[PDB]
Design an enzyme around this catalytic site. Structure first.
Site, mmCIF file in Angstrom:
data_model
loop_
_atom_site.group_PDB
_atom_site.id
_atom_site.type_symbol
_atom_site.label_atom_id
_atom_site.label_comp_id
_atom_site.label_asym_id
_atom_site.label_seq_id
_atom_site.Cartn_x
_atom_site.Cartn_y
_atom_site.Cartn_z
ATOM 1 N N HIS A 44 0.806 -1.238 0.000
ATOM 2 C CA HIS A 44 0.000 0.000 0.000
ATOM 3 C C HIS A 44 0.827 1.270 0.000
ATOM 4 O O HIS A 44 0.299 2.309 -0.331
ATOM 5 C CB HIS A 44 -1.096 0.051 1.090
ATOM 6 C CG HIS A 44 -0.657 0.510 2.435
ATOM 7 N ND1 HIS A 44 -0.416 -0.389 3.451
ATOM 8 C CD2 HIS A 44 -0.491 1.773 2.915
ATOM 9 C CE1 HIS A 44 -0.050 0.339 4.495
ATOM 10 N NE2 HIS A 44 -0.069 1.640 4.222
ATOM 11 N N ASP A 93 -0.932 -7.207 1.563
ATOM 12 C CA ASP A 93 -0.247 -5.948 1.621
ATOM 13 C C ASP A 93 1.250 -6.209 1.818
ATOM 14 O O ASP A 93 1.769 -6.048 2.914
ATOM 15 C CB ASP A 93 -0.827 -5.097 2.776
ATOM 16 C CG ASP A 93 -0.451 -3.646 2.735
ATOM 17 O OD1 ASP A 93 0.253 -3.246 1.789
ATOM 18 O OD2 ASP A 93 -0.876 -2.891 3.655
ATOM 19 N N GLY A 186 2.915 6.103 8.612
ATOM 20 C CA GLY A 186 4.353 6.320 8.526
ATOM 21 C C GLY A 186 5.163 5.142 9.022
ATOM 22 O O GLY A 186 6.341 5.015 8.670
ATOM 23 N N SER A 188 4.004 2.050 8.404
ATOM 24 C CA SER A 188 3.636 1.064 7.408
ATOM 25 C C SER A 188 4.803 0.531 6.643
ATOM 26 O O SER A 188 5.617 1.304 6.151
ATOM 27 C CB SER A 188 2.663 1.663 6.413
ATOM 28 O OG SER A 188 1.515 2.104 7.112
ATOM 29 N N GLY A 189 4.808 -0.787 6.473
ATOM 30 C CA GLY A 189 5.855 -1.480 5.760
ATOM 31 C C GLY A 189 7.060 -1.799 6.609
ATOM 32 O O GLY A 189 7.959 -2.491 6.147
#
Ligand SMILES: *[C@@H]1O[C@H](CO)[C@@H](O)[C@H](O)[C@H]1NC(C)=O
Length: 241
Positions: A44, A93, A186, A188-189
Site C-alpha cells: 500500500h 499488503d 508512517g 507502514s511497511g
C-alpha cells in the site's frame, strides 16, 4: 509509533526509511532489509505513485532530520507487489524492493532473519514494532526511530474487533485491550519483529489499523511466515540457475 520510546544506534539495524522525492522529499513508509539487495515493505506504500525514479531508501539511520542531500541512499531496481494485492484494499499488503546496488553489512545496517513457512503455528511472546510514524492519530512524522513492546492477539480475537472486515490467516494482529500502544501512519511497511530462541525474527510487516492505539483495536500486520514461499520464489535471480 504510539506510546513508544527512542531507539539506539544498532538496536534495529534492519529498519529502513522509504522516501518519495516529488516537490519535497518525505518519508512515506518503513521497510526491513532482508538481504544485501532486498527490502521487504507493504504494497500500500506504492498506491497512486509510479514504481520508477521517485523513491529513495535510507538505511543505517536513526534520526530522519540527519538526512540531507549528502546522505547516501539506495535506489530501486525493481518493485514486486503481491499479484493478489488490490490498491486501497487490505489483503496481501506486501512488496519486495530490489536495490540497484548491494548494501554492505555493519552493526548499524544488517538484515532481519526471516521465519520459516512452518513457523505460522508459533505464538511469539517478545515482540517489538519500530518506525518514524505518527506518535498519535492524525499526528506527524517522528524524527527519532521509535520502538514499542506489543503483544499478539489471536486471529479470532482480532476478527471480533474488526467485524466489518475479514482478518485472514495471512495477517497477524497485535495490541492491548486498553490501547495506548500501537503503530500508526508512517510506520507502514516496517517490521514487527519477535525475539524467539535467543534471536530476532521478522514476524509481520506493519499494514493497518482503525486509527491508532484505540482501545480494543489491535494493529493488523502482514504475517511474513504465510508469504515465505512467495518471498523465496520472488528473490530468485530471474536469470536462472
Ligand atoms: C528522544 O530524544 C530526544 C532527546 O534526545 C527527546 O525528544 C526526548 O527526550 C526523547 N524521548 C524520550 C521519550 O525520552
Amino acid at each position: 509509533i504510539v506510546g513508544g520510546t527512542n531507539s539506539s544506534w544498532g538496536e534495529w539495524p534492519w529498519q529502513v526509511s522509504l522516501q518519495v522525492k516529488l516537490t519535497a522529499q518525505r518519508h512515506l513508509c518503513g521497510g526491513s532489509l532482508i538481504g544485501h539487495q532486498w527490502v521487504l515493505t507493504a504494497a500500500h506504500c506504492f498506491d497512486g505513485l509510479p514504481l520508477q525514479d521517485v523513491w529513495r531508501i535510507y538505511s543505517g539511520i536513526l534520526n530522519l532530520s540527519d538526512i540531507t542531500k549528502d546522505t547516501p541512499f539506495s535506489q530501486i531496481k525493481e518493485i514486486i507487489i503481491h499479484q493478489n494485492y488490490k490498491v486501497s484494499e487490505g489483503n496481501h499488503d506486501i512488496a519486495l524492493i530490489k536495490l540497484q546496488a548491494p548494501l554492505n553489512y555493519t552493526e548499524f545496517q544488517k538484515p532481519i532473519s526471516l521465519p520459516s513457512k512452518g513457523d505460522t503455528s508459533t505464538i511469539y511472546t517478545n515482540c517489538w514494532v519500530t518506525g518514524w510514524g505518527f506518535s498519535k492519530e492524525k499526528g506527524e512524522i517522528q524524527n527519532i526511530l521509535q520502538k514499542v513492546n506489543i503483544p499478539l492477539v489471536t486471529n479470532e480475537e482480532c476478527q471480533k474487533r474488526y467485524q466489518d472486515y475479514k482478518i485472514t490467516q495471512r495477517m497477524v494482529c497485535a495490541g492491548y485491550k486498553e490501547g495506548g500502544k500501537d503503530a500508526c501512519k508512517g510506520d507502514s511497511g516496517g517490521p514487527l519483529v519477535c525475539k524467539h530462541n535467543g534471536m530476532w525474527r521478522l514476524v509481520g510487516i506493519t499494514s493497518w489499523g482503525e486509527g491508532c492505539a484505540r482501545r480494543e483495536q489491535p494493529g493488523v500486520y502482514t504475517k511474513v511466515a504465510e508469504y515465505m514461499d512467495w518471498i523465496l520464489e520472488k528473490t530468485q535471480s530471474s536469470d536462472g540457475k
